[PDB]
Amino acid sequence: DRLWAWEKFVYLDEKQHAWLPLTIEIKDRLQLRVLLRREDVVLGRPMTPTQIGPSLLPIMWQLYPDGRYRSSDSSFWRLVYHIKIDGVEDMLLELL
Amino acid sequence: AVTDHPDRLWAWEKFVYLDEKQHAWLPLTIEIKDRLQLRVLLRREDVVLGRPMTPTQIGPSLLPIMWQLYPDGRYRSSDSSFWRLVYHIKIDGVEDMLLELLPDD
Amino acid sequence: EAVTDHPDRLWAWEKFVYLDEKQHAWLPLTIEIKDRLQLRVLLRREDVVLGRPMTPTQIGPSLLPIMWQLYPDGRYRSSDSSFWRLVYHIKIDGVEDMLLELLPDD
Amino acid sequence: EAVTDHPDRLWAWEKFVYLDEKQHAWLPLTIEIKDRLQLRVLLRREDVVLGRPMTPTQIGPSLLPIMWQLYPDGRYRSSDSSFWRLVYHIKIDGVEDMLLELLPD
Amino acid sequence: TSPQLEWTLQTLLEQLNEDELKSFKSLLWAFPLEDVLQKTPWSEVEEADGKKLAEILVNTSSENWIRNATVNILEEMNLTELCKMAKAEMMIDNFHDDVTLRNQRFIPYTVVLHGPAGVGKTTLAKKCMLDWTDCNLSPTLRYAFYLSCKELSRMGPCSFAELISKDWPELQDDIPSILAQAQRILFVVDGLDELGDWEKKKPVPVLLGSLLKRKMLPRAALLVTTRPRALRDLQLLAQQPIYVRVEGFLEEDRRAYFLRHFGDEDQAMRAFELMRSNAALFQLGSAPAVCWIVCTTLKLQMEKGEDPVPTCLTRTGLFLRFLCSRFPQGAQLRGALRTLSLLAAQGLWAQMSVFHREDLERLGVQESDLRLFLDGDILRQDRVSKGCYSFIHLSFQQFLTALFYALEKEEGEDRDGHAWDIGDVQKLLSGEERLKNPDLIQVGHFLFGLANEKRAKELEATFGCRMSPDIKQELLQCKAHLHANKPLSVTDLKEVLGCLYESQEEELAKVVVAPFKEISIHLTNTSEVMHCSFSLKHCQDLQKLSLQVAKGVFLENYWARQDLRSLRLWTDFCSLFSSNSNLKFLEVKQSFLSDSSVRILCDHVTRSTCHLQKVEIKNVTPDTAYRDFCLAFIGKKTLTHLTLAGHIEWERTMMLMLCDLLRNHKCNLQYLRLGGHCATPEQWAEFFYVLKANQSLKHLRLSANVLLDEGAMLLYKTMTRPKHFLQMLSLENCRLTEASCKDLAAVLVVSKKLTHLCLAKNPIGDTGVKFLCEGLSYPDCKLQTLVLQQCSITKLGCRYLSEALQEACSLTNLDLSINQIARGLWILCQALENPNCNLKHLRLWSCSLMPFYCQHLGSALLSNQKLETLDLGQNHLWKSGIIKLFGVLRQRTGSLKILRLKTYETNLEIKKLLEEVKEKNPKLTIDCNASGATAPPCCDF
Amino acid sequence: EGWRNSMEKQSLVWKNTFWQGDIDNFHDDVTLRNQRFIPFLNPRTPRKLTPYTVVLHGPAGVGKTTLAKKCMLDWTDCNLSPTLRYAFYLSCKELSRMGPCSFAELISKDWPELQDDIPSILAQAQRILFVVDGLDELKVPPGALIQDICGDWEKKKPVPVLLGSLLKRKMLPRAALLVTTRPRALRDLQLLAQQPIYVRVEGFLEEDRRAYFLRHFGDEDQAMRAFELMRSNAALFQLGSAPAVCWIVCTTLKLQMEKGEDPVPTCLTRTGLFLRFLCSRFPQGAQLRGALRTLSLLAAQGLWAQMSVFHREDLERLGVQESDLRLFLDGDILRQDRVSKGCYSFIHLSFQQFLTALFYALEKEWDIGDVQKLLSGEERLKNPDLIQVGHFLFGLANEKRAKELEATFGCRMSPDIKQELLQCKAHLHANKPLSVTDLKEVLGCLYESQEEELAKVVVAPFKEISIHLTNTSEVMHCSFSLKHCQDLQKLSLQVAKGVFLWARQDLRSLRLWTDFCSLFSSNSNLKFLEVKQSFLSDSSVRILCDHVTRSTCHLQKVEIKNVTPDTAYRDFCLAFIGKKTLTHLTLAGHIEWERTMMLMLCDLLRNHKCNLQYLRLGGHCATPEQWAEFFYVLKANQSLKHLRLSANVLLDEGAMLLYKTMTRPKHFLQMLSLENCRLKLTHLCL
């Protein structure tokens, strides 16, 4: 439903299960690809936005109709696929 | 296996770098394992040239604006961190380059 | 509507695509021939995307020159050593237009 | 009115003057361009005195070819192996006119 | 330091034209150089002009060396006239205070002040003395004494104590006590040029010489004021002095003075602008008196509602108007004007600046006329020492001197009771008199200015005198100064053009500028442009021209009106190219131009009345100039040469133009050079592709351009085709290695049109030499020339060259230098011994050879049959090698015609051997002066 | 004719006009080079009635007597002319001893046969040539040359009177005079001579040294190797303008190379070279201790009284035995002058200085001062020739050299030399720009010593230094010495043109620069740096930046002025991002703003790790857009407090943007200045 950034490259969902970005792929100026994996990792203090510094990925994601995601910056993303391997969930998104 | 490494790299357009000889380099993918494990693979490809977008237009990004090579084979970026070269090989005319981030002490 | 400003150059980025000194694009529309020694060419302004710059070998032979340039007295010198005269340059419906002629060789 | 006849072949005799097998003088009056693959030229038949044949070297490079050929199915062959199409061939008030076109590969 | 020697050396050199100056530098270099000079970079010497070259010599070399170096060089070059000249000489308040405050700070100590007249040295000294009196200075100065040559030149012998106490009788009782404290005394000598026991009576000159020599009161402080003319004696008199220079008003102070005098801002600024429009009159405005004259004249004209523009056009008009406006109307004082002219002439000839009542009496000047002479401000009475008089300023004295010469001379005036110290026109215009008395140069310009007719008419109408009509012919009788039969140096041309502009009569200019054949110009400000435009339009046989523009003429790229005036004058000036149809060579170098000026120049160059045949561009800014010039020179029917150099980067537009310049069908080019052009391999590839179509180019130079060897390989792979047309080719200093030599060998073996080559300044290496030699061996090789100057080759390369030459090749010319062949020299000697050799020339300049190896060369020369020229230089075979070579070559009369080597002609035995060889081989010319340090270039090859 | 025939026999000795053993007489070119500047040897010279005086002056060992001999020989030949030709030569060495007599008797002492005709020859004054040689070796009371000047040549007067007459030209005014001297005695001639002409003698130049090397060695490879060795040491190179020094170096290196030993160490320092020379001029096991003591004492005596030529009586006064004289002569220590019998002298000046120093070091058991007197500044100024003895004394302080000398000659070295040197330590402190030259001297002395303990103790208390490099040797000295400083707090650096410009030379220069730059990283307390008016290269600049960027440097205030090439400003600006300790930064120079430099400035002011508290610029040119972006980025900075944009081209739009920025509340600057732009907040100026 929603993803909140708790640590750099760490995201907590509506159920507060950590999602760890793994890779960021660029094909064209309008093609930005990022993969997400859900794995429980020891969490630290909430890195306030200033501590995080500049970053390409947004701070927040929220579910949008039509298989799309709206980011904190008002940008929109599309969900390509989502599977479960050996108990670990995977989510892949592409920029719009 | 390329022995002559580039001397400079400037950000001309979002995700496009020009080298000392003005050949457009493109970063293919960014692989991150954790805060201390970051590496980027660069490839050489001739792409159409637009207008030079100003820093305000490029916007915030993970990568540094420009690179620079110091003796002892290390790369220093404008953000004050040191990048170590991993490999640089040529296959059928296409050149691949991978750079690693050294966590500054 | 008459215009009091003129372009000081016209490179040939692509065949039938000219860019003035402010990187605006001009496109030729039609070519007029009245006789052997009279040729009048019509230029129009329009904004279009630009591809890769075709090199001189790719451009090939053509009737128009590769580069104009303004000279005092209000005459253009093409790249083939011939002088071109300015006929008129007006604005209509917000669209820029220009007409040029080929003067007899001195 | 439209005329079925048409020159089989055309050859350039001078600068901006052509001759057909009948040796009628066909001249270009205007050229209309919409893009590289879309190019149009207009022809008219007039009576004029022919000078010495200006050999192609003196004519110099030009957008028009040195020879124009005609084939069935609206197929025209030029000296440079390009193809052209005929749009209309009419006679009005005693003047005969013809229009050509350029077809993308 | 001695300012005298620098001034004397500068003036002589500026009389040399371009051709002579180049020889002078070369001859000087061959001269035995002091160790300090050699450290200087030879590049700087070449670029230095006449004035700077003098500065370089004086700041590094001993005085005696300079004197003998100059005289010997000129005598050898056969400039006899200059040799005689060289030998003779070589044998209102709040402003003056502002200047003096900064001047004073630049200062037993010996101080000398020197500067041009009217700059205010006496005010500076008096300000220092007043500061001493007012306790402003340090308290250490307890006593100071004032001595003036203006007065002391007449008083008879006496004692120094009495001399200095003459003006202060009360102090004589304290003179011994004062002089017991010599360390607290300050002495000032004012106006030197106008010229042991303090209680011992002696002549005034003896006392002054002793004090200047510090023979009396040695531990006092001295301060001297003099003009640069009389600075010579102080060198022989003073011991370890220090020199200080004064300058006077500046632009800001001139503006302030104008504001003070006029009062009204509008009037003051209008007048200041009108004055500054004239550079020559502006420079003379530093002296306050000149500004006084200008302000008075312009204000008087303005109050009367008259146009001031013609007044400031030239000096003579201004001074003439002022003089006309300083005497009563209707008097027609012919006699007074003649008297004043004669008095000024006498004063100028005798070099005296002050006159006493007795001097005025001697010339019959009635004291009644002094009322008009003074109240009109022509003469100024000194208020300190009564009975003295002087002229308002030096320039006014010079103007009156000119008025004397142009004034009509009466019959029998040689019968006067005095032998006047007046020369004649020819003596006045002579150069030796100019050097002896530098104050007649300005009289020359003024005299030229008075040759007009309108000014003579106005002067006669206002005063009623009579004017001599023979001046127009007398000036041209010294026309030999102009008919030197050689191009005039820059300074001489400036002087002649300035005088002609002063004349303001075209009929005077035509007869003088008719025979010019070559010209060089160096613009520095607007006035020079205006003068050149006015004068040179009448030339018809002009054939060459070299141009140059200094910074500041054209305003930086962005005031609009200031640049507009310059643009208008530039457009007027650029009509020489269009009108003159005999001009056949141009050159432009080191100019700070601007886009508009370049566009105007090209517009005038593109017309059909111009018949240029060669062109050159070097180090021009901005960087659009090269592109515009390449555009303008397309289709020129006559053009057959073209050069471009500088620092450029190949923008795509430049690539377009530089390819179209060769694609065209009207092209008639025959030689093309490029320099400092950086570009990517793709641009070079397309350029070399375009070359394939050209059917006129024959030469091609690429000096200083970067090929990176990739352009080179592309070029060679282009030349292997069977239909190329280039014949010469030169890749001087293009970052080459041995990698590309294989393709060069392929070109040599396959080509059928290539017949020259050059690779100077490239460490290609012995492997590259080996590849080329493998190339040469093929039977069908047609290359006839080859140059490998300074290519870092070793004895292995020499062995390869000899092995290649051993066969029946077609090579005839070969040039080696810098790179050394000493150890392998015997190998090349063996190669020469081979009957199959066909070499005709061979250069071994600076090859580090030892005398032991002269045997091989001697035997080879005695054996060979086809060699016709050999060049040896910078070798150590000077004495023993000379002996052995001359002894060996005495045996046979070989075909050799020209042999070059360095010798000393002071040895009798060497002279005898040379005479014997010459007698037995009269057809052999031997160059004994190979000491020249300039290498044979690649221009011929 | 008959007189010339007798003279021709004497011409044989003067015909030894080349260095003893010269290969092919190289001195011919050197002598004949300077003959163009002598007036009375130029027939072209105007034949006036004014008689001339020619004064030759040049440092010691440059061989002027040889040029005078050549002039005499040329005059004797005398290409047929109506005037007669006679030549005579007087040396000041024997004038200081002769008693009163007439000029005719004075000049006939060495020509008894012509004595009766001497008056006639004197009568024909025009045909006479006079050579007065060795004016620095004249021993007379003060002012004795201006007393009772005599005009008649046959009137008997004291010798100083005769000299004062002849030089001042009161007697025989029509003859030609040639006076030779060293620069020390150039003041008397300014008074005595009337209308003098000065000629300078300079001896071998670089190419002449190369030719001498090639002729001596014979083989090109060894000759060039030895020449490069010599050219490594600039200070020892300068002494190569005298032929004798070059002969010494060539003999030493050739002998070393012949036996196969390593020659590189020998040319590393002057004292080592001379010690190696000295150790090989006597047969082994000769027990010459007394001889060495006497020789050292004699050298000291000579240098103290300012006497360079000793007679047999002077050597007698020290008890030197004829054997000792033979051993010195055969060993090439003393040279017996050929012309005037009874005169000797040392092979050169420098060898005399070195031998004098050996007297100071040697252990004890005449008019010679103490060490404090020797190092006193007043004595140095009075007698400049004592300076080199200081460097030689320092060099001899090493323990290894002392041990070598002890094993060789069995002598004993005084252990108090180190302490005596250190006692004078107080004299060196200058701590001001004057320290430049004094610092050079101290560094030279220490580098000569080669012992790290002495340097450690000497350079401990320095606080401020200035450096002015002019050649590689200076860089080597600084690197060797300064590394031990620990209380340094300020450093000003300047490099002269010519240090950086052959691949081997460039490699050596880069290696030495890399060694030199290690000061910044190793030393921590250093806090202030400055560079001005330097000629660098890309590699050196990059190395300097790499060393500055390390984590030990704690700089706070940095200034750059007039550096070349122009890329240096860009590199330095890049390398200074994130150095927290940095607070002040200045840049000055003439350069156009490239897009890259604009990016670097924007980033430097944008970084969140920046802590700058001041910034000043100058001499920068850019378009309004670049200035607009610069000022837009500056809004994001919250640390900078002071700014100054004096002397920059700027643009009207940029100035307007700056004016808007000043009044804008968001901007955190406190003082601003836009001086010379083509014209929190407390201060403002436009």
UniProtKB/Swiss-Prot annotation, chain B:
Query: What tissue expression does the UniProt record report for this protein?
Result: Restricted in the T-cell lineage to immature thymocytes and activated peripheral lymphocytes. Preferentially expressed early in T- and B-lymphocyte differentiation.
Asked if Endoplasmic reticulum is a keyword of the record, the answer is: yes
What GO cellular component term, any one, is given?
Answer: nucleus
- Localization terms from the record: Cytoplasm; Nucleus; Microsome; Endoplasmic reticulum
A single GO BP term for this record reads:
intracellular signal transduction
- Note the effect listed for D7G: Greatly reduced binding to AKT1, AKT2 and AKT3. Abolishes nuclear transport of AKT1
One MF annotation (Gene Ontology) recorded for this entry: protein serine/threonine kinase activator activity
Q: What is its main location?
A: cytoplasm
In terms of Gene3D superfamilies, this protein maps to: TCL1/MTCP1
Highest taxon in the source lineage: Eukaryota
Keyword list, A-Z: Chromosomal rearrangement, Cytoplasm, Endoplasmic reticulum, Microsome, Nucleus, Proto-oncogene
Q: Which InterPro entries match?
A: TCL1_MTCP1, TCL1_MTCP1_sf
Q: Tell me the subunit arrangement.
A: Homodimer. Interacts with AKT1, AKT2 and AKT3 (via PH domain). Interacts with PNPT1; the interaction has no effect on PNPT1 exonuclease activity.
Which clinical disorder is mentioned? Answer: Chromosomal aberrations activating TCL1A are found in chronic T-cell leukemias (T-CLL). Translocation t(14;14)(q11;q32); translocation t(7;14)(q35;q32); inversion inv(14)(q11;q32) that involves the T-cell receptor alpha/delta loci.
| Record-stated family | Belongs to the TCL1 family.
Functionally, this protein is described as follows: Enhances the phosphorylation and activation of AKT1, AKT2 and AKT3. Promotes nuclear translocation of AKT1. Enhances cell proliferation, stabilizes mitochondrial membrane potential and promotes cell survival.
Q: What is this protein called?
A: T-cell leukemia/lymphoma protein 1A
UniProtKB/Swiss-Prot annotation, chain D:
Top-level division of the source organism's lineage: Eukaryota
Q: Which GO terms describe its cellular component?
A: cytosol; endoplasmic reticulum; nucleoplasm; nucleus
- Which tissues is it found in, per the record? Restricted in the T-cell lineage to immature thymocytes and activated peripheral lymphocytes. Preferentially expressed early in T- and B-lymphocyte differentiation.
Q: What is its main location?
A: cytoplasm
Q: State the InterPro entries in the record.
A: TCL1_MTCP1, TCL1_MTCP1_sf
| A Pfam family this chain is assigned to | TCL1_MTCP1
Provide the GO biological process annotations: intracellular signal transduction
Q: Which keywords, in A-to-Z order, does the entry hold?
A: Chromosomal rearrangement, Cytoplasm, Endoplasmic reticulum, Microsome, Nucleus, Proto-oncogene
Q: How does it assemble?
A: Homodimer. Interacts with AKT1, AKT2 and AKT3 (via PH domain). Interacts with PNPT1; the interaction has no effect on PNPT1 exonuclease activity.
The UniProt function text for this chain reads:
Enhances the phosphorylation and activation of AKT1, AKT2 and AKT3. Promotes nuclear translocation of AKT1. Enhances cell proliferation, stabilizes mitochondrial membrane potential and promotes cell survival.
Q: Which disease is it linked to?
A: Chromosomal aberrations activating TCL1A are found in chronic T-cell leukemias (T-CLL). Translocation t(14;14)(q11;q32); translocation t(7;14)(q35;q32); inversion inv(14)(q11;q32) that involves the T-cell receptor alpha/delta loci.
Q: Which family does it belong to?
A: Belongs to the TCL1 family.
Name this protein carries in UniProt? T-cell leukemia/lymphoma protein 1A
The gene is TCL1A
Curated annotation (Swiss-Prot), chain F:
Q: Name one GO cellular component term.
A: cytoplasm
Q: Which residues form a coiled coil?
A: none
**Tissues in which the protein is found:** Expressed in numerous tissues including uterus and ovary, with low levels in heart and brain. Not detected in skeletal muscle.
Report the outcome of K382R: In HYDM1; uncertain significance
Q: What induces it?
A: By bacterial lipopolysaccharides (LPS) and IL1B/interleukin-1 beta in peripheral blood mononuclear cells.
Membrane-traversing stretches: none
KW Thylakoid (keyword) present: no
* Molecular functions per Gene Ontology: aspartic-type endopeptidase inhibitor activity; ATP binding; caspase binding; identical protein binding; interleukin-1 binding
Keywords from the UniProt entry: ATP-binding, Disease variant, Leucine-rich repeat, Nucleotide-binding, Repeat
Give start and end of each NACHT domain: 52-365
Give one GO biological process term. Answer: negative regulation of interleukin-1 beta production
Q: What is the effect of changing Q190R?
A: In HYDM1; uncertain significance
- Which residue ranges contain the repeat LRR? 485-501, 523-546, 609-633, 637-659
Q: Which residues bind ATP?
A: G58, P59, A60, G61, V62, G63, K64, T65
Result after altering N648T: In HYDM1; uncertain significance
Protein role:
Inhibits CASP1/caspase-1-dependent IL1B secretion.
Whom does it interact with, and what assembly results?
Directly interacts with CASP1 and IL1B.
Disease entry from the Swiss-Prot or TrEMBL record: Hydatidiform mole, recurrent, 1: A disorder characterized by excessive trophoblast development that produces a growing mass of tissue inside the uterus at the beginning of a pregnancy. It leads to abnormal pregnancies with no embryo, and cystic degeneration of the chorionic villi.
The family annotation for this protein states: Belongs to the NLRP family.
Spell out the protein name for this chain.
NACHT, LRR and PYD domains-containing protein 7
Which gene is transcribed and translated to give this protein?
NLRP7
